[PDB]
Structures are given as structure tokens and as C-alpha cells.
Write a protein that binds this ligand. Structure first.
Ligand code: HEC
Ligand code: HEC
Lengths: 108, 108
């Protein structure tokens, strides 16, 4: 791809410091500011049940792959204009790689 | 995405007439001219065990999503120069959509 595996250990702590405020990843984890992310890889954007997403994220209808997820994370609003995710992005590829490595694993 | 679901029924018969010559899709199906495709979505190219792939397909290291799969199928050799898949492609989007719909389903 254009995604290279990194450190899941490193990725777990980036999740905690940059995503945990708004999201859960475990199966059976609740929706918070953002939706629970269990089973996100391979899914299309805006389909978790019982979460109120923006029109923007549903219509973009992104198919979530480690690769896709990387561009999103770099700059969420530049990737999906209209998204309400108020994350300013992970600008370093090395951070994105580690985070994705972790997510790939915990969201399964 | 840029993949719209189609007819799985239609997709099953396109598979039979355009892919079955070289591939199986069922779990536990054998490798033939081409590799068994069970569990291909989400996987990277050239990783089925016990299949001898080209250098080209392993190094391209494509991450298989309905979207990716679509470009491949349009023109395999233009998408992965060096691939030994001797398919000249599915030029109509409507055929690709139906086929992918089917594959999404049977490869699971
Ligand atoms: C609150 C301040 C957030 C932080 C920090 C992060 N995310 Fe987020 N996320 C948030 C919202 C409000 C939403 C919904 C967007 C909308 O327009 O409706 C999202 C959405 C996602 C998604 C898409 C989910 C889907 O399609 O089901 C993903 C993949 C995602 N968020 C991941 C993610 C990661 C990995 C984060 C840390 C780097 C992160 N988000 C931060 C709110 C917030
Ligand atoms: C024989 C004449 C083939 C036909 C007809 C189709 N495919 Fe094929 N496929 C074939 C080979 C020899 C290979 C290996 C390529 C290499 O360079 O090593 C492939 C490979 C695939 C792949 C990639 C598999 C992977 O990464 O594990 C896919 C996704 C694939 N083939 C799909 C596919 C479909 C859907 C077809 C019908 C439209 C089809 N192939 C035709 C040989 C042949």
C-alpha cells in the first residue's frame, strides 16, 4: 500500500492521547462524542448504528482501509469537508503508521 | 466509495464465465492457474500461502478493497505492470460492480 506497519505499542498510546477523548475501540464500547470504532476497517463511513453523523461523512461514503484512514487522519476536514470531527490531524507519517497499526489490531 | 453495489446474481455468472477458469472463491478451494480468492478483501496482494506469485504483484503490495479491485479488473497489466494474470479486463463499470458485489459476498 502506502501504509507501512509500525509499532502497535506506540500506536496504543497515541490512541490514548489523541483519540480516546472522543472514541472507544473495543467490541461493545459506547459511542461518545465520536462513534465506537470496533470493526471500522472495510466498513463505509457513517454506518455505525445509533450514532448521529454529519451529512458530509455519510455522502463521502469512504471505504475504510489502512490507506484511506491515513489520509483522513492527516487532515480530517480537508479530506471530508463538513465533517464535525474536531481533530486537526496527525501530520507525521510515522505517527499515522503506528496509530493505524494499533487500530488495525484493536478494532478487529 | 466509487464502487456502487450491483447484482450478486449477475456477478455470480460473470465470475463463472470470466474468472472460474483460473480461480476458486470458496474457503478450502484450491489454487489453480490463479490463487484461491477466499478472504481477499482487506488483504494485501501476493500473500496467499502456497501460491507462486510474480515479483510485481508482491511489490505493488495493493490493499484489496472493492475500490482497488475495480481498477485492477478494468485492466490488470496496466494496474500492475508485470502481473501474469492474463485477463484483458472488465471495461464496463456495471459489470465490475456486479462482479465485486458477488466477490464481496462469496469471499467472506
Ligand atoms: C473529538 C474531539 C474527536 C477526536 C479527538 C477524534 N475524533 Fe474521530 N470522530 C469524531 C466525530 C465527532 C466523528 C464523526 C464525524 C462526522 O462528521 O459525523 C468522528 C469520526 C471518526 C471516524 C469515521 C467513523 C465512521 O465512519 O464510522 C474515524 C475513522 C475516526 N473518527 C477516527 C479517529 C481517530 C483514529 C482519532 C485519533 C487520531 C480521532 N478520530 C480523533 C470526534 C473525534
Ligand atoms: C487465468 C487466465 C485468469 C483469469 C481468467 C483471471 N485471473 Fe485473476 N489471477 C490469475 C493469476 C495468474 C494471478 C496471479 C498474478 C501474479 O502476478 O502473480 C491472478 C491474481 C488475481 C488477484 C490477486 C490475488 C492476490 O493478491 O492474492 C485477484 C484479486 C484476481 N486474480 C481476481 C480475478 C477475477 C475477479 C477474475 C475474473 C474477472 C480473474 N482474476 C480472472 C489468473 C487469472
Amino acid at each position: 500500500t502506502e501504509f507501512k506497519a509500525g509499532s502497535a505499542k506506540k500506536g496504543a498510546t497515541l490512541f490514548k492521547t489523541r483519540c480516546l477523548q472522543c472514541h472507544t475501540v473495543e467490541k461493545g464500547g459506547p459511542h461518545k462524542v465520536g462513534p465506537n470504532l470496533h470493526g471500522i476497517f472495510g466498513a463505509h463511513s457513517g454506518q455505525a448504528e445509533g450514532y448521529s453523523y454529519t451529512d458530509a461523512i455519510i455522502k463521502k461514503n469512504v471505504l475504510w482501509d489502512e490507506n484511506n484512514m491515513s489520509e483522513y487522519l492527516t487532515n480530517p476536514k480537508k479530506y471530508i469537508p463538513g465533517t464535525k470531527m474536531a481533530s486537526g490531524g496527525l501530520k507525521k507519517e510515522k505517527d499515522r503508521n503506528d496509530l493505524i497499526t494499533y487500530l488495525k489490531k484493536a478494532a478487529e
